UniProtKB/Swiss-Prot annotation:
Effect of residue 170 to A: Abolishes demethylase activity
Protein keywords: Acetylation, Activator, Centromere, Chromatin regulator, Chromosome, Dioxygenase, Iron, Isopeptide bond, Kinetochore, Metal-binding, Nucleus, Oxidoreductase, Phosphoprotein, Transcription, Transcription regulation, Ubl conjugation, Zinc, Zinc-finger
Full-sequence portion shown in this chain: 80 to 444 of 1096
Compartment list: Nucleus, Nucleolus; Chromosome, Centromere, Kinetochore
Family: Belongs to the JHDM1 histone demethylase family. JHDM1D subfamily.
Protein name as annotated: Lysine-specific demethylase PHF2
GO cellular component: kinetochore; nucleolus; nucleoplasm; nucleus
UniProt comment concerning the protein's domains: The PHD-type zinc finger mediates the binding to H3K4me2 and H3K4me3.
Any coiled-coil regions, as ranges: none
The encoding gene: PHF2
GO terms for biological process, alphabetical: chromatin remodeling; liver development; negative regulation of rDNA heterochromatin formation; protein demethylation; regulation of transcription by RNA polymerase II; transcription initiation-coupled chromatin remodeling
UniProt subunit comment: Component of the PHF2-ARID5B complex, at least composed of PHF2 and ARID5B. Interacts with HNF4A and NR1H4. Interacts with RELA.
Domain JmjC: 118-274
Length: 365
């Protein structure tokens, strides 16, 4: 007799379990200290909690902004993805109907909205991602405004979760990093380090037919518990395997981004999700396109280095090597035309690869 993940009993069982504190792993940092220099010094390999939004350059509405306000600014008629936590099955419904449920007393069901991207709505102007995210983000820096392919629509999510909701262990799509801001309520994260063997266990667990009957954290050494409270912001690094529990009704904002400190992990995660073939619904759209733009940027940086007389930093050269490898796999004979759909206009992949390979050789000397 197995326990279904996200069921009433599961939650009761999970609430009772003791986990190691995120204390020893999650750094608490004031917003003004979260700079590019800080990220480079530490490598953004561990999650970071910023207890107050001051200095982050994050814009969000006041905590007097309610789910009812979300309905108004997003649009009552908007189709949204709703997860039935007690079944771990998703469905579609008008936001109006979810909001109706949310304000119901005697909720029979445990339902959440965790995929509402609002950048195309009136609510978009009320939220601006942290400055550090804009500084790190490959799309923000390298995807041109006049591009014929649409930017990955992953920059502004509104998360609405009722008390006792649960999101099972996962790695976010594209191995993207995340910022996560709790506006009202609190959100508990269960964090697992993306050590290589953990990643492999994760892939095997997730590919198993009975994954919903198995608590993944049982298979790893350390799963850290991190409570994120009202007004706090959590930055989750590339590749981290995590689940969440919602202790009280919670409203949160989040966004996802790729960056130059985790090229290797981004590719490893992308490779895993492609073998899993999930149709994630939360997929990082045009991950490959963002990588092509990064690759073009790196080539320009290499060429520029000859005029500046200053070498690119080692992690960028290593990043270039990893990207060039991916570029080769995506354009191989058998490498499909699913891959060609993600190539930006005006790209000559075989020429880019050859030019990057040469610049890398020159740089290494
Ligand atoms: O909000 C939650 O409980 C879970 N959200 C995520 O996993 C995410 O934003 O990527
Ligand atoms: Cl990005
Ligand atoms: Ni997630």
């Amino acid at each position: 007799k197995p326990v279904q993940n996200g069921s009433q009993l599961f939650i009761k069982e999970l609430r009772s379990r003791t986990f190691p504190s995120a204390e020893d792993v999650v750094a608490r940092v004031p917003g003004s200290q979260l700079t590019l220099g800080y990220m480079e010094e530490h490598g953004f390999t561990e999650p970071i909690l910023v207890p107050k939004k001051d200095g982050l350059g994050l814009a969000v509405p006041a905590p007097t902004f309610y789910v009812s306000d979300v309905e108004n600014y997003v649009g009552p008629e908007r189709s949204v993805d709703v997860t039935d936590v007690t079944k771990q099955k998703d469905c579609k419904m008008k936001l109006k109907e979810f909001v109706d449920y949310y304000y119901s007393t005697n909720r029979k069901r445990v339902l959440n909205v965790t995929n509402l991207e609002f950048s195309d709505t009136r609510m978009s102007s009320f939220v601006e991602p942290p400055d550090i995210v804009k500084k790190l983000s490959w799309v923000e820096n390298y995807w041109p405004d006049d591009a014929l392919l649409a930017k990955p629509k992953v920059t502004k999510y509104c998360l609405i979760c009722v008390k006792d909701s649960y999101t099972d262990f996962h790695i976010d799509s594209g191995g993207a990093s995340a910022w996560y801001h709790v506006l009202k309520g609190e959100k508990t994260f269960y964090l697992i380090r993306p050590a290589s063997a953990n990643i492999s266990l994760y892939e095997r667990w997730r590919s198993a037919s009975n994954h919903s009957e198995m608590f993944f954290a049982d298979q790893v050494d350390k799963c850290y518990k991190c409570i994120v409270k009202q007004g706090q912001t959590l930055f989750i690094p590339s590749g981290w395997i995590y689940a969440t529990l919602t202790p009280v009704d919670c409203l949160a904002f989040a966004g996802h981004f790729l960056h130059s400190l985790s090229v290797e992990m981004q590719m490893r995660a992308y490779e895993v999700e492609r073998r899993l073939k999930l149709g994630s619904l939360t997929q990082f759209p045009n991950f490959e396109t963002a990588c092509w733009y990064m690759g073009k940027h790196l080539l320009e940086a290499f060429k520029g280095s000859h005029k500046s007389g200053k070498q690119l930093p080692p992690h960028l050269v290593q990043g270039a090597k990893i990207l060039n490898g991916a570029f080769r796999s995506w354009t191989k004979k058998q490498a499909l035309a699913e891959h060609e759909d993600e190539l930006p206009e005006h790209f000559k992949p075989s020429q880019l690869i050859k030019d990057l390979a040469k610049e890398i050789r020159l740089s290494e000397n």
